[PDB]
Amino acid sequence: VNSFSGYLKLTDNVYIKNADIVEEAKKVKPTVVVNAANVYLKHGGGVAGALNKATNNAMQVESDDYIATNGPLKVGGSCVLSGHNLAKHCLHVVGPNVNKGEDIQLLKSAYENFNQHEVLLAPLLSAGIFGADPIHSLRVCVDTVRTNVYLAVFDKNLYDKLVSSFL
Ligand SMILES: OC[C@@H]1CC2(CCOCC2)CN1c1ncnc2[nH]ccc12
C-alpha cells in the first residue's frame, strides 16, 4: 500500500492520472520523481522547467555541478540526484526529443531506467515539448516498465484521449 490517490489502474503495475506532476510530488513526497531531462540537465521548459522552478532553482544548481563533473547524459540514459522539496530522489531520464531528430527507438531504453526503482511518479517520456506521440509513450511504458509507475498526465484532452484509446 502507498499514498498515491485517484489513479486509474491500467495494468498490474501502471497507473495514470490527470495531474500536475509538481503538485502531485508536493503532496505525496514520493521516493522517486522522474524528470523529463535533457543530456545537459538544462531544466528550461516542460516538466523539467516546472520541477526546477518548484525547487527554487536548487535542482538546476545541483545539476550544473553534476554535469561539470560527469559530462552529459546519453539519450536513453539517466542519473539519480536529489528530489529537493519534491521527493527523496529525482531520476533524471532522457527520452529522445523528436524536435531534435533523435531516434524514437531510444524511448524503450529510456523507460528501462525506471526498472531500477520499485515505485516512481513520472511523466510520459518524450511527450509534450519532446515531440513524440503520447499514446505511443504510454504503450512503450506499459510494455517496458515492470516496477510500479504512477503516471501524471498534464493535458486533460491528452488524459481522456490516453484512457479511451488504451488497449
Ligand atoms: O507527462 C508528460 C506531459 C507532456 C506535456 C507536454 C505536451 O502535452 C502537454 C503536457 C508536459 N508534461 C507534464 N506532465 C505532468 N506534469 C507536468 N507538469 C508540467 C509539465 C507536465
Swiss-Prot record:
Assembly information from the UniProt record: May form homohexamers. Interacts with N protein.
Protein name: Papain-like protease nsp3
Function: Responsible for the cleavages located at the N-terminus of the replicase polyprotein. Participates together with nsp4 in the assembly of virally-induced cytoplasmic double-membrane vesicles necessary for viral replication. Antagonizes innate immune induction of type I interferon by blocking the phosphorylation, dimerization and subsequent nuclear translocation of host IRF3. Also prevents host NF-kappa-B signaling. In addition, PL-PRO possesses a deubiquitinating/deISGylating activity and processes both 'Lys-48'- and 'Lys-63'-linked polyubiquitin chains from cellular substrates.
Mechanisms controlling activity: Inhibited in vitro by GRL-0617.
Domain of life the protein comes from: Viruses
Reactions it catalyzes: Thiol-dependent hydrolysis of ester, thioester, amide, peptide and isopeptide bonds formed by the C-terminal Gly of ubiquitin (a 76-residue protein attached to proteins as an intracellular targeting signal)
Record localization: Host endoplasmic reticulum membrane
Signal peptide (from-to): none
UniProt membrane topology term: Multi-pass membrane protein
Domain Macro: 1-167
